[PDB]
């Protein structure tokens, strides 16, 4: 009554079957990566087949490519001898074994929590190599031990995903106010901004309520209200990639020493912002279109690893500038069945 995903190998016909492409991330624990393999004997002695899960992290900037260096680290590597020529079976594994036959051999992994979610940095038009970001791979090798070089004639590769979804609890609603005292004696000026809630589903409008009470003789020239996205990187001491993904330079002149309150709407979306290379987007299987990065939440007690993406609405007032940052989180709701992992209409 269900379906799985299958990949094959030329020499050994090592048919790797996986229950799902993605694996949701509860903060306490990650859903298990459970699957099976059909391993027809294409040998007489090479009776070992190994399954390796690798949470690779690749990175490289424009000037890094110009100089000729790009970093890549294996955050987590797991090797299991799935064929006993341990790991008690599961329901889906049992159903697959009943379908498959005797040669079906299970393999089960668990991803330790707080590992970074599958987030890929958007490549530029010139960028054509392996995509930069956090990508999870499951591979199968038909060899003996690990002394033999991993031969492409036998290996099987599949790209999996680890993602998070918005919690039911909204959390504290973001809100921030700042009053600046100008150089003319101590004359204040108050700015306040508030959001609708803390978790926003991708594409939903953001109704930032902004109110300014100027206790001065000056005038507000313009109001730049933007949605900045910060993609911190926790390896090789790389800087914090900051990038505005939505904007509105709404100009409004307000009477000196007076009040003015209203709401400004901003919506992040990939249509207007498809050029800013290095932007963090959700996991791409094979260069497919994906939304922005799902804002990771380290609710556990935690360790900074991988790419930590977050979003904050920054409101700036000109004359220097009064700036206020309201952090929040952009993430999908809980899907019913699963994401299609591709554009829903293919072509």
């Amino acid at each position, epitope marked *: 009554g269900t379906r799985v995903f299958k990949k094959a190998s030329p020499n050994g016909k090592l048919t790797v079957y996986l229950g799902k492409r993605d694996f949701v991330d509860h903060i306490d624990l990650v859903d298990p990566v459970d699957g099976v393999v059909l391993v027809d004997p294409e040998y007489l002695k090479e009776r070992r087949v190994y399954v390796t899960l690798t949470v690779a992290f690749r990175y490289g900037r424009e000037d890094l490519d110009v100089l000729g260096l790009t970093f890549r680290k294996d955050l987590f590597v797991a090797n299991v001898q799935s064929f006993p020529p341990k790991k008690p079976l599961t329901r889906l594994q049992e159903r697959l074994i009943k379908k498959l036959g005797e040669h079906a051999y299970p393999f089960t992994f668990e991803i330790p929590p707080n590992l970074p979610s599958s987030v890929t940095l958007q490549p530029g038009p010139e960028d054509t190599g392996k995509a930069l970001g956090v990508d999870y791979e499951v591979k199968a090798f038909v060899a003996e031990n690990l002394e033999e070089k991993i031969h492409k004639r036998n290996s099987v590769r599949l790209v999996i995903e680890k993602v998070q979804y918005a919690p039911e609890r909204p959390g504290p609603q973001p809100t921030a106010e700042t009053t600046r005292q100008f150089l003319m004696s101590d004359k204040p000026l108050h700015l306040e901004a508030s959001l609708d809630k803390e978790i926003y*589903y991708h594409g939903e409008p953001i109704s930032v309520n902004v109110h300014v009470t100027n206790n001065t003789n000056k005038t507000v020239k313009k109001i730049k209200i933007s949605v900045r996205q910060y993609a911190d990187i926790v390896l090789f001491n790389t800087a914090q990639y900051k990038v505005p993904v939505a904007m509105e330079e709404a100009d409004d002149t307000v009477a000196p020493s007076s009040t003015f309150s209203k709401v400004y709407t901003l*919506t992040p979306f990939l249509a207007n912002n498809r050029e800013k290379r290095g932007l963090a987007l959700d996991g791409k299987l094979k260069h497919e279109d994906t*939304n922005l990065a799902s804002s990771t939440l380290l609710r556990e007690g935690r360790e900074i690893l991988g790419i930590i993406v977050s979003y904050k609405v920054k409101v700036k007032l000109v004359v220097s500038d009064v700036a206020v940052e309201l952090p929040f989180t952009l993430m999908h709701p809980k*899907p019913k069945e699963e*994401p299609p992992h591709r554009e829903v*209409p293919e072509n």
Partner: single-chain antibody
Amino acid sequence: DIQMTQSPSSLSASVGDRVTITCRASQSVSSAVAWYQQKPGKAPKLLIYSASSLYSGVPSRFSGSRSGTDFTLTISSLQPEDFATYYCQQYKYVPVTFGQGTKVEIQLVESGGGLVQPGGSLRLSCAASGFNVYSSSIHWVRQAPGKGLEWVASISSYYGYTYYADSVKGRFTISADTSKNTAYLQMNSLRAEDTAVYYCARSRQFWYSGLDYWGQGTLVTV
């Protein structure tokens, strides 16, 4: 494209029958199928999406089944309320070619149409209330008088994608005006080539759980 053979194309019976409607695809679509139902003078309402994932707001009589490349809709008890023309939408690939369309026998606002000159251009406005154009995907679907439903236009604002059928490529301009949270379709054609009734429709932007909401529509009669 991919064709949807819907055998049988005409099933009429009394109440209480477990009527089964099959739907065959020329190419594999991998459990990406939707089924609708519409009444005379009424826009359709989705019943099944994504291969037997029952849509909220309809009874549990209806069900689906991905039998190889064939998909089946089943009504256990043919209640008197279930007397409508049914269809078989597929959405795995582009276009969104529908099915044959079988009958059974015993706040979107689309405006800016009416009786049309033999040739020229028209503007059809779909005022979409209840969602943001970035959080939804706005489609436009036509039906000739007493004929099947065919996808006409589509806009996906979040990705900034504009889509039209291969047979209408260049003859329609779909746009998403976020100022009024509305959609606009500009037609530049002539004669009774496309004289029909046109429905605006909305779909969940991201995972596309079928075209959930449909407008009243108007008669574009040349």
